[PDB]
Symmetry: D3
Subunit: 322 residues, 6 copies
Amino acid sequence: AMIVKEVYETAEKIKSMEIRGAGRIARAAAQALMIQAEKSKAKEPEELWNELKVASKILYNTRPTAVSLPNALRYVMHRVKAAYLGGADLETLRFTAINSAKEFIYNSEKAIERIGEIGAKRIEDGDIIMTHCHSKAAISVMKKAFEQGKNIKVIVTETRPKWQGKITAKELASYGIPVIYIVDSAARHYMKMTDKVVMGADSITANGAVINKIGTSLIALTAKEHRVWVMIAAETYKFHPATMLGQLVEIEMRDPTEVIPEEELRTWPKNIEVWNPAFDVTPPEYIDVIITERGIIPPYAAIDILKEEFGWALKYKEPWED
Amino acid sequence: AMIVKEVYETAEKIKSMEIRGAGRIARAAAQALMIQAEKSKAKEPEELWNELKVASKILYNTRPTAVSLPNALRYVMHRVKAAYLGGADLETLRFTAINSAKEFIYNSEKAIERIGEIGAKRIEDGDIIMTHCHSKAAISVMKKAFEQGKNIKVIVTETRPKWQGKITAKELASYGIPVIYIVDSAARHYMKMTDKVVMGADSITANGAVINKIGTSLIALTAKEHRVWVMIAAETYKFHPATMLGQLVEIEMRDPTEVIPEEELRTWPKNIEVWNPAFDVTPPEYIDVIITERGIIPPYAAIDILKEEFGWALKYKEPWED
Amino acid sequence: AMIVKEVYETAEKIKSMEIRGAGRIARAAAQALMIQAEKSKAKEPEELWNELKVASKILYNTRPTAVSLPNALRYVMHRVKAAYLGGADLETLRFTAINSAKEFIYNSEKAIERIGEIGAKRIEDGDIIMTHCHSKAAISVMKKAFEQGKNIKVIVTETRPKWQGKITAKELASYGIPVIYIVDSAARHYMKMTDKVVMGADSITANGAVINKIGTSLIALTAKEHRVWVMIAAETYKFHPATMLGQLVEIEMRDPTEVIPEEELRTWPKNIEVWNPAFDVTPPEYIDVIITERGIIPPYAAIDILKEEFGWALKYKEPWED
Amino acid sequence: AMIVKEVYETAEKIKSMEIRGAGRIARAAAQALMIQAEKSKAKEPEELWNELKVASKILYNTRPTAVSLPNALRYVMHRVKAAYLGGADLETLRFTAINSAKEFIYNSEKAIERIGEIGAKRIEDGDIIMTHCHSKAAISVMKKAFEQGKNIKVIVTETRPKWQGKITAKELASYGIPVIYIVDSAARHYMKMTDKVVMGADSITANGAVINKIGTSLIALTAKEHRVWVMIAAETYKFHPATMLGQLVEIEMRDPTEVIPEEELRTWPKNIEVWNPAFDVTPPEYIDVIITERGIIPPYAAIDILKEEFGWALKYKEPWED
Amino acid sequence: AMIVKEVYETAEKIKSMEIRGAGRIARAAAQALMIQAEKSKAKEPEELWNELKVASKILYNTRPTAVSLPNALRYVMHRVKAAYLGGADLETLRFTAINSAKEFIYNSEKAIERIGEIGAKRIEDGDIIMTHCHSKAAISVMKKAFEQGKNIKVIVTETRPKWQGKITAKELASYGIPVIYIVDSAARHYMKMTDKVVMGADSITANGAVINKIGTSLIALTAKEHRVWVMIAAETYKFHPATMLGQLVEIEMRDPTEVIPEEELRTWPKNIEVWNPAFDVTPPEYIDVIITERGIIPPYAAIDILKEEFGWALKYKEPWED
Amino acid sequence: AMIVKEVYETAEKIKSMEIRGAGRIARAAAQALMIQAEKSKAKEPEELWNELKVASKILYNTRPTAVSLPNALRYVMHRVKAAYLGGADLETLRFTAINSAKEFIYNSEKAIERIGEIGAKRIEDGDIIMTHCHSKAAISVMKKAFEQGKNIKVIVTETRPKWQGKITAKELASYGIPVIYIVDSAARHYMKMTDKVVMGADSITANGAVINKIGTSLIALTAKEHRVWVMIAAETYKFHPATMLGQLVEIEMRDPTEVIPEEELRTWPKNIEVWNPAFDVTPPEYIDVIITERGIIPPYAAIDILKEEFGWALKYKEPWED
Ligand SMILES: Nc1nc2c(ncn2[C@@H]2O[C@H](COP(=O)(O)O)[C@@H](O)[C@H]2O)c(=O)[nH]1
Ligand SMILES: Nc1nc2c(ncn2[C@@H]2O[C@H](COP(=O)(O)O)[C@@H](O)[C@H]2O)c(=O)[nH]1
Ligand SMILES: Nc1nc2c(ncn2[C@@H]2O[C@H](COP(=O)(O)O)[C@@H](O)[C@H]2O)c(=O)[nH]1
Ligand SMILES: Nc1nc2c(ncn2[C@@H]2O[C@H](COP(=O)(O)O)[C@@H](O)[C@H]2O)c(=O)[nH]1
Ligand SMILES: O=C(COP(=O)(O)O)[C@H](O)[C@H](O)COP(=O)(O)O
Ligand SMILES: [K+]
Ligand SMILES: [K+]
């Protein structure tokens, strides 16, 4: 297969986390398939289909946990598969894929702004919000609240090991929003002063559980303990189809050296293992609302979102398989 | 007025956390009073007494939260003040000061051994133990349980911002004990495989609360959620006598640059505030046992420890006070 | 501009709580639109439409918290607006307004009967039921359970400040049902002898929360503690559609003189503030079932009620809006 | 009036629990409806209709608590009744009853196979599983998982009074799955070593509560306490449609001799009452998932299963009534 | 017996609650026995003893629940009994009683000021405190905090039926302390803004339970739910000796007309009973600290207070019996 | 070396549980020490000392879990060992052992009588009481309460595997107390109608945990869940002194044939392991009180009982060791 540079470059950048955040990963994946179809020198449809199947496989095999990624590929390639199988000629297939990926990207961009507007109504003037990691959906909520003239202050948790909290702090401060930066360990200590917790999602399961950045389940746990609302800002493509039929979401273990740098870890005794899980599972009981682009829901209504938007595709194989 | 150099160095080193851990700080402070008395050039008792007061003050204004520090200074200075006021000559005062310091130091070492022997009975073959920070008292228990031939494995949290987890990890590894090293945020994610939690204490209050390294409360919180025993390994001089008459324990706010290094932090805008609490408060409902040198107690019997050993002193002003 | 006297009187009476209870306020507002249309002197549809908008506005700016009120106005005005914009003549508009009002009123009466029949199946012979405020929906259930020959007894909380408990007590007594009347503070003390709790609702939100008379949350809280079922008797028009897109429900702050009478309160110093919230929010974890006219649901299925019946309308501005 | 003896044999064997488990009972009731129709000597259609109505009532008044039974009779008699009322001649009616019976029986076998496949995905290699009673749907999950190569052990609670746990223990051992057999009272003691709990269901209600073998709720309670997942394996015909309209599920009280044998019980004093409830009610807060043949749901979504599958039938009388 | 006016007048004023609050009731009881001994025209000691025995019986038989009352009588009359039984002459007995009662009154007055000083250290600048009823011990804490220059605001609950909250509000406002007055039902609604809860006690039991004004257990319940500290300001004479050997504290039921005035209750149907319990029982788990004149304790240390101060007297009959 | 057969008969009958219940076992072990001393044919004091040391070891290695047994042997052998080491001649030693045995046995009977009297005060007229196993101290409470004229019923759980519940059921019926007999699994189902729970104890630990019959912790858990008081009737010799120095209590694992009889179990596959734990561990958060013969304590005060009664003995070896 004639796979372009940008398919490979994108895949490496998802793996190394130079491209990160479940939304962005999903847009970038779709963007890459768009560039494949723009640049394909293929002659036959069968030839282009094969390229897109394989480019998709490459992109799916990057990072497992955020279902946003395979939902983006599925979006582009359910359509490309339907086109091809009703013998669409070449340019019809090339446009199906290009236009499909443009829809997904537009809809991601729109969904996020919309989550901002909905979630900001749940924020009150004077609120101290605590967040975790760097979530574009959460930030959209917080930023929108601030543009509505509510005087807010955000507590950013640094978010080890990769320090996503630095990104969140600088970003929010740059829209004018006062930020309080603390270590992940201080979450409970400062939960007393916190009015609302607003965080993102990578996968959301049928029974209402939220897989998000390591440490999320802790922040939610103590938030529930103090009766602070836990609001998870999440696009409907964050919801995980295979969990309808009993799939456990894989938890990404990343390299030990994200925790202890190589120069130091090589000096450490052999009887120490560094474990670096990238995500944990917050059960639904610690979640008050999931804010989607289609509105506020309780977390136990995640199965409704998946039935009405993804149910149909689970008797079908994956649209890049054969 | 005529204070030796070892007092000043010791205080500089407690401030800087070159010397750290509650127990060690207490011993280092006794030592410093010891050396002041050993090397004094005083001629009258009143002169030595005056040096030992001032040196006491300097040592106390180093770090507020670990009560071990002022409890050590009191063990020396209660005895030194009663001698001075009983008319003791120069050399009798000098020796009360030196010999009191030596007793505290000897009792601190024996107590930690004994805590180890007692706590280790609560560890069972195969156990997986989560800990936090670096606590000599906690390590005593794990070390002794391994020497007894129990195959334990210790989950060690890195303990940001100052990374005491690293100290714990290398230490435990050095005794042959296998370690699983994780970031603080992962503590709930791994609580499901943990059998015991074993941490230390800086201050323990009348009502049973444990003030220990920032994050301790979170670990205890999710331990409870999971029905994992939380054991606090702690010497009687970790108990806080001022709290029987309602004193709140000061939580030390340490420098922002421990969290975000100087180079970086100077690049950040005014409207980010870095907050660095070094301790939090874990409520007694989340603690199962405190393991002291005089045995196992439930946290609520903190008051009995305080009454039977420290109550007597609360009608008096402070031993180093004029 | 040309608003009848019955509209103005009805709004005065909703404000003053001469007419009160969510369900009754909704019916009273439909009625008032009915009478405005019956008695209008308009010649063109545009003139009647203009009266029905203004009368709607006046009725809506009476009391914020019970969503039954604006849901009643919408049931009339959605239908009136679609007729006007479909070119309806004067008399066709007049009749859409009158007949819509009549349908709402008829459905409000049938729904409360049906809630009664459904909820009464969950009451068992010998039961002791705590209630709160005066709710027609709750009373429907108790009344019907007694008529079925079940020997029930109802603990009635006085419901300060406005004393709706008294209304409930006299009513239940009048049907032959024995009552135990207690102050609000005694609710936990008597929860141990209570078998069921049965209250009403003013608004029910997307995520399952019940906004009902001040104190309801406390009663539900200790009911849970005690494992006593909390049943909310509530019509579909108690559900709040604005909350699916993240609106917070306004909690009505009523006059201080309801708490402390005018004579007394004028004798009190400036630095006492009397605060009179008329409602609180009970979270869904403390509610076991909502009993609607279409059946039993768990509180989390509030969103399904809102979606299938009210979602359609949230792309449009308000039916009475210009 | 002319009822074949197979109907009576079945009904007897359901009362005495020679035929047991909610699925098997249901299949056995349809099988008897099937045989009644095959072997009927009725010469008019009205006469067969009367034999089936009657057979249905004989079968329904055996064991009240498992809704599987009346849902089976419903499946057949809704269709037999629609045929009959549309003029169907004799042999059309007979076939409708036989083929409806056959449909339900094939569907039951297929549903359980599919629950096994959905549920096994939630069992991970290593897992220890506690179960209760003998449930064909719980066993499907445990069997498929072992067939998939996962090394599991199963804690089989003995399930007094009727010792269902022995059936489960021998069965699982027979597939090569190691069993740990314990008394019901040991559930909490061993819940620390348990990773998943998997049990059946006799009825599931509109608000998500699960009715299953006496003891199930105790196991789900201490499982929640310890954060072990509680998974209910339940065919959709275990869901109870009368509960949408507020019905309480009857709790069968079986013979005292099941607890204490006849020989011994007759010697006991009159003032010892032996109470044998055969089922209890587990609230939905202690259930993490229900695994049906159409996928995983949170317990709150039972109402969705009921709305879509059974809600149509509630405004009509029962299918076997005059 | 020659009983004085003031013994009778005091007893009526305790019953009618013109004299109220457990501390004050106890002082007034002791004051009354003081006035008996001042004015007794008795000639013999046996004659005076008999007067004091009977005057005590009168005073004990006023209100049952606040153990402060019998502890005050016991204080005076353990001593008077010991004096008399070592044949103290008349004036020796008269002084024993007068002086004993002066000690109790001085010690009550001192203990309260002291509880103020201890408890105020647990109050932080900016705190919103919620209280209940009118407690001199609680007010001492709050007032002292305010005199220390901490800027506080107190939420006073009105405290039905008898409105003790009016007393609390006016009193606190008169020391300059901003007060927020609300109904007992609003406690949970406003618990989010509350930093500390400070309340009194009437009886405290061996196992740590606090009997205080009806509604106390509710406020503590929701305070625990939100992690607001519950601090009970209580003198050591609030602790209940007989609970060491298994006594249940009697809960005072007061007259129905405290709830519904006579003029209205006489018009109400016969099938309504008004129940007016004056106190409820807050379990120890909802209490953080009990502040006594001897310091902060956890509530589980109430048995220590009773052992060291009251244990001795429980093999003896009551010191006014014969 | 010369051991009387009564010692061996006793030890056999303790292993086989012909002698059972923690109190009775203890009395029976002292009785055997007593008979050994009475019937000894030793002519030197050293020779009797050796027979008692040995008798003690034979008795201690019967059943590990109930500390009552070694605390009984301790009571005798501390005193026999103090006599022996103070030069005591033969007949002085013999008497010391007989009279110590006799003291412990009289004390046990008196302790249990007094627990009945303290504990009955906590039972109120009407009460329904759930219990577990057969406990002589729990039965004392229930009996005294009935003797006092209170109309109670008792829910007697059958207590598998050894059916202790039948002993309890017949015994209580024999005093005229109505019994409800249920299987262990029915505990939660019937906890709603239960007002008090009253059970025994085999050991009680330094931190307040109670070791009692397998199932006790499940009953205490659902009792807490429902806010039913859990009361433990326990003589002070049930408190476990090794636990002050960190010891874990051994959980006796008895024969699998107690669960499944020999005849049946031999037919079962090899891959079914039958596990028979005879005790479990109830944490102190689920126990409201321990009733001892010296009064009511919260479970946290067990450490106070231990400090004052047994702490002296811990720095010495066991009384029967060389
Ligand atoms: N914050 C704080 N709490 C303390 C201190 N001493 C004792 N405590 C007690 O520790 C507990 C902490 O509860 P939290 O607010 O963490 O839920 C409270 O019961 C509080 O009364 C102290 O110095 N600071
Ligand atoms: N205060 C408030 N909470 C609401 C409203 N609508 C829904 N909720 C939800 O109701 C719950 C109340 O939780 P609470 O803060 O009482 O513990 C939260 O989960 C919150 O998200 C509303 O209008 N006001
Ligand atoms: N006991 C019982 N509860 C039911 C039934 N149907 C639904 N429920 C619901 O199941 C829950 C029972 O919880 P529990 O009382 O065990 O704590 C309640 O939410 C109740 O409203 C039924 O038939 N029986
Ligand atoms: N399992 C066990 N726990 C004990 C023992 N002695 C004291 N404990 C204490 O009892 C509690 C057991 O609670 P659980 O683990 O059932 O939740 C813990 O606080 C533990 O520290 C013992 O011998 N065994
Ligand atoms: O319950 C009340 C008043 O009861 P009443 O008003 O019915 O006498 C008070 O909280 C306590 O008695 C403590 O008050 P104090 O601290 O002043 O003793
Ligand atoms: K577990
Ligand atoms: K109960």
